[PDB]
Design an enzyme around this catalytic site. Structure first.
Site, PDB file in Angstrom:
ATOM      1  N   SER A 215       0.760  -1.251   0.000  1.00 21.45           N
ATOM      2  CA  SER A 215       0.000   0.000   0.000  1.00 21.45           C
ATOM      3  C   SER A 215       0.800   1.317   0.000  1.00 21.45           C
ATOM      4  CB  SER A 215      -1.013   0.004   1.148  1.00 21.45           C
ATOM      5  OG  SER A 215      -1.910  -1.091   1.096  1.00 21.45           O
TER       6      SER A 215
ATOM      7  N   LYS B 212       0.294   3.885  -2.911  1.00 24.15           N
ATOM      8  CA  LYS B 212      -0.851   4.798  -2.914  1.00 24.15           C
ATOM      9  C   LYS B 212      -0.478   6.271  -2.842  1.00 24.15           C
ATOM     10  CE  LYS B 212      -3.857   1.191  -1.222  1.00 24.15           C
ATOM     11  NZ  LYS B 212      -4.365   0.516  -0.005  1.00 24.15           N
TER      12      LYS B 212
ATOM     13  N   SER C  24      -5.990   3.655   3.760  1.00 30.57           N
ATOM     14  CA  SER C  24      -5.429   2.624   2.890  1.00 30.57           C
ATOM     15  C   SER C  24      -6.511   1.795   2.196  1.00 30.57           C
ATOM     16  CB  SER C  24      -4.483   1.720   3.673  1.00 30.57           C
ATOM     17  OG  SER C  24      -3.517   1.143   2.813  1.00 30.57           O
TER      18      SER C  24
ATOM     19  N   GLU D  75      -5.096  -3.916  -6.944  1.00 33.48           N
ATOM     20  CA  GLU D  75      -5.358  -4.460  -5.617  1.00 33.48           C
ATOM     21  C   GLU D  75      -6.378  -5.585  -5.801  1.00 33.48           C
ATOM     22  OE1 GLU D  75      -3.924  -3.854  -2.864  1.00 33.48           O
ATOM     23  OE2 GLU D  75      -3.195  -1.800  -2.826  1.00 33.48           O
TER      24      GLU D  75
ATOM     25  N   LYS E 158       2.786   6.604   5.415  1.00 35.99           N
ATOM     26  CA  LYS E 158       1.920   5.661   4.717  1.00 35.99           C
ATOM     27  C   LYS E 158       2.538   4.285   4.925  1.00 35.99           C
ATOM     28  CE  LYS E 158      -1.427   4.103   2.349  1.00 35.99           C
ATOM     29  NZ  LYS E 158      -1.337   2.984   3.328  1.00 35.99           N
TER      30      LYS E 158
ATOM     31  N   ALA F  54       1.152  -3.548   4.100  1.00 38.40           N
ATOM     32  CA  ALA F  54       1.232  -4.925   4.558  1.00 38.40           C
ATOM     33  C   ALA F  54       0.913  -5.765   3.332  1.00 38.40           C
ATOM     34  CB  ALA F  54       0.216  -5.178   5.659  1.00 38.40           C
TER      35      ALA F  54
HETATM   36  C1  LIG Z   1      -1.639  -2.209   1.910  1.00 36.78           C
HETATM   37  O1  LIG Z   1      -0.545  -2.688   2.040  1.00 36.78           O
HETATM   38  C2  LIG Z   1      -2.902  -2.747   2.605  1.00 36.78           C
HETATM   39  C3  LIG Z   1      -3.987  -3.004   1.543  1.00 36.78           C
HETATM   40  O2  LIG Z   1      -3.379  -3.643   0.443  1.00 36.78           O
HETATM   41  C4  LIG Z   1      -3.400  -1.701   3.605  1.00 36.78           C
HETATM   42  N1  LIG Z   1      -2.338  -1.219   4.487  1.00 36.78           N
HETATM   43  C5  LIG Z   1      -2.240  -2.039   5.679  1.00 36.78           C
HETATM   44  C6  LIG Z   1      -1.307  -1.426   6.720  1.00 36.78           C
HETATM   45  O3  LIG Z   1      -0.648  -0.403   6.421  1.00 36.78           O
HETATM   46  O4  LIG Z   1      -1.215  -1.951   7.859  1.00 36.78           O
HETATM   47  C7  LIG Z   1      -3.685  -2.189   6.204  1.00 36.78           C
HETATM   48  C8  LIG Z   1      -3.876  -3.435   7.110  1.00 36.78           C
HETATM   49  C9  LIG Z   1      -4.200  -0.929   6.956  1.00 36.78           C
HETATM   50  S1  LIG Z   1      -4.684  -2.409   4.696  1.00 36.78           S
END
Ligand SMILES: *C(=O)[C@H](CO)[C@@H]1N[C@@H](C(=O)O)C(C)(C)S1
Length: 263
Positions: A45, A48, A105, A141, A209, A212
């Site tokens: 993420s 983004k 996110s 995504e 930002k 995961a």
């Molecule tokens: C991105 O890596 C994920 C959606 O693909 C989002 N970001 C995570 C994070 O930063 O912990 C999330 C669990 C909030 S969802």
């Protein structure tokens, strides 16, 4: 400071996986500290921020408007869409989508914006055009979070992401108004609590930002500094660990604690 590198190495020992790290001076672009700066890691993420940077450039060029309303449907909803799922009836504006994609996110928001700019291939072209010949977005995504070992799709290098973020936040690429909007969205991040923010002292500024993905993929990009003003960019990525989310969060937070302590 080299003591932070000791903690980064310790994080690798604790997680049993690679950890990429870089601390960059926001003003001069000087690399202050690094660990696996030129190895590839899944962006997850964190892309983004780049996506909305591309949207803002289109807005500056008059090719897009912050207030334009996008009318999506329940067919567009993908996993983890806390904001978009609540606005199916009236849709959301481009500004709201970027706010959602960055602060919460939201995955569907990212996909919707991705379509407006021309997809992964246009975001990658945008990056290439601003001097980043490393970072690449290939999928949408949630597929982009696969984190397949040795796969170069949807990856960046700590040094590439760091220098690209610096350009977006301080370069002439975006208008001042747009640069500020991007930083404002990042400062309002609501889902990165247990990471660098848990180690941030009172009075300090932070715009970030997180991400995961997967195979233990975890990461965060941020602009932070004392006295309510950012002065450095920090990028931290890890992948391959079999550790729990909490364990990964803790290690990132501890690297942050070392970073702050030795500022
Ligand atoms: C991105 O890596 C994920 C959606 O693909 C989002 N970001 C995570 C994070 O930063 O912990 C999330 C669990 C909030 S969802």
């Amino acid at each position: 400071h080299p003591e932070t590198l000791v903690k980064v190495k310790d994080a690798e020992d604790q997680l049993g996986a690679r950890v990429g790290y870089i601390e960059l001076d926001l003003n001069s672009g000087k690399i202050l500290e690094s660990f696996r700066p030129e190895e590839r890691f899944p962006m997850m993420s964190t892309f983004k921020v780049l996506l909305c940077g591309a949207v803002l450039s289109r807005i500056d060029a008059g090719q897009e408007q912050l207030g334009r309303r996008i009318h999506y449907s329940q067919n567009d909803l993908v996993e983890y869409s806390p904001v978009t799922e609540k606005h199916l009836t009236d849709g959301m504006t481009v500004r709201e989508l970027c706010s959602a994609a960055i602060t919460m996110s939201d995955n569907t928001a990212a996909n919707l914006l991705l379509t407006t700019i021309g997809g992964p291939k246009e975001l990658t072209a945008f990056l290439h055009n601003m001097g980043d010949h490393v970072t690449r977005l290939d999928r949408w995504e949630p597929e982009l979070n696969e984190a397949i070992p040795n796969d170069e799709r949807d990856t960046t290098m700590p040094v590439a992401m760091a220098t690209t973020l610096r350009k977006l936040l301080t370069g002439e690429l975006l208008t001042l108004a747009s640069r500020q909007q991007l930083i404002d969205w990042m400062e309002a991040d609501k889902v990165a609590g247990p990471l660098l923010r848990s180690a941030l002292p009172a009075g300090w500024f932070i715009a970030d930002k997180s991400g995961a993905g997967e195979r233990g993929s975890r990461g965060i990009i941020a602009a932070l500094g004392p006295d309510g003003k950012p002065s450095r960019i920090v990028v931290i990525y890890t992948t391959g660990s079999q550790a729990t989310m909490d364990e990964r969060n803790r290690q990132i937070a501890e690297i942050g604690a070392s970073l702050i302590k030795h500022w």
